[PDB]
Amino acid sequence: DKICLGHHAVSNGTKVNTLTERGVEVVNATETVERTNIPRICSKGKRTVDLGQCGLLGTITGPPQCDQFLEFSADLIIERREGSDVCFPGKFVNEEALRQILRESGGIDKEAMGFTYSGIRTNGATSSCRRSGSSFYAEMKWLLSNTDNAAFPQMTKSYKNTRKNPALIVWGIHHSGSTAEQTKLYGSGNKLVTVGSSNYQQSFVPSPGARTQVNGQSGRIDFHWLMLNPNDTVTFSFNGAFIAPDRASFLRGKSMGIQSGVQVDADCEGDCYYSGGTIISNLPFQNIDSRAVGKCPRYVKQRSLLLATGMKNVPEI
């Protein structure tokens, strides 16, 4: 009699790349690089904030677009392309560092500054920000002098961080659209804004002048920020052109942020996100988006890689 050993085979099979030769036929192989996704952000079991029309940095300054998100608390922050953190033209300096701080911040817990002003009207307003009629940013007071061309007095203000967590202090400098506007707004004189703390010192100079019109007006606000250690005091000195904070922003905990263009799905549990959706798959690698964040597979360039899950497909005769 006779006995013989052998092994299973299929008529088709798939091909894999090996160490010595490429294109080896195997019975089956799987992919280690994910290409299938859900074109929506799946976020379940996490507090998610959908910052639709308002940029993440506006959750400090309070443009009308995010009046409901001033004190938001979330584990996952969604930032969208159509939004903006500016309602009066301008930008933050070192805005990327502050965005990185906010994405990890866990949300914003605002505690009032406790500042009292005298001889200065705090009801400044612009036509660009339109919460109702004309209104300015919610979390900041646009300081004026009194009447048109009235002088702005020099003053000193200070804030002590009485909590255990560090405070995020944000303020702005107003750059008027012309010297005539500054003549009307803040009167006339040399302007200097000085900011300091035990480990921080800077000063800013307003620079009035003609600029391209954005959202109907040429005036601009440059937003600046400070990270204040516990028991430290921030001292501010004004001659005008100051957009003053009303409350200090404390961080609530830990979170992550996403820049994305798709809707939020509350049903799936997912860790890896990219601008087109979420990648929920326990594969070693992905070839979808090199900037994907979270607990995500490693990005590779290959369109596909087939890792054999069995031996070579020696065909039957």
Binding site: H8, T18, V26, V293, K295, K301
Partner: protein, 167 residues
């Protein structure tokens, strides 16, 4: 007719990966080797369990899609990310190539381990013909097929059979 792994695979094994084919005076056919299949599957699944292990490192955004970062730090980030991507593409191709080479060599090694086990079990009662078959000089139609598939084969009773007939 009785194909062997040395020349050809089998399309008749649907109950496992490795197995035996038999030809005798009562019938012909196949059977799967449960233990060899389960061992090879356990090693490959453990390999996948290593490869598919989730990373615990949380990564944050250091770029910006909506606005641009400063060009010098932007290009430094792009270069670092592309160099890391080249490193991970190299590791991914090396890992897949080495796991595919190890998987094929492992399964063929396991086939050799079973083959040597059968040869060692049969000793002087069978001869390798180079096609993956064992030519057996001890006539058996029924019990020997299961006994050889198992380890509960006592080659000594038929031993006389596998010398008289092959000399």
């Amino acid at each position: 007719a009785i194909a062997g792994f040395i020349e050809n695979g089998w399309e008749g094994l649907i109950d496992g990966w490795y197995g035996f084919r038999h030809q005798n005076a009562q019938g012909e056919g196949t059977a799967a080797d449960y233990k060899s299949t389960q061992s090879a599957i356990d090693q490959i699944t453990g390999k996948l369990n290593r490869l598919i292990e989730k990373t615990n490192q949380q990564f944050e955004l250091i770029d910006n899609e909506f606005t641009e970062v400063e060009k010098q730090i932007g290009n430094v980030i792009n270069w670092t990310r592309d160099s890391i991507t080249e490193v991970w593409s190299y590791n991914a191709e090396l890992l897949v190539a080495m796991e595919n080479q190890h998987t094929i060599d492992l399964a063929d090694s396991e086939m050799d381990k079973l083959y040597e086990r059968v040869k060692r079990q049969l000793r002087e009662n069978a001869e390798e013909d180079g096609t993956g078959c064992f030519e057996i000089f001890h006539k058996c139609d029924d019990d020997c097929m299961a006994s050889i598939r198992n380890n509960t084969y006592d080659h000594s009773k038929y031993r006389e059979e596998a010398m008289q007939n092959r000399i």
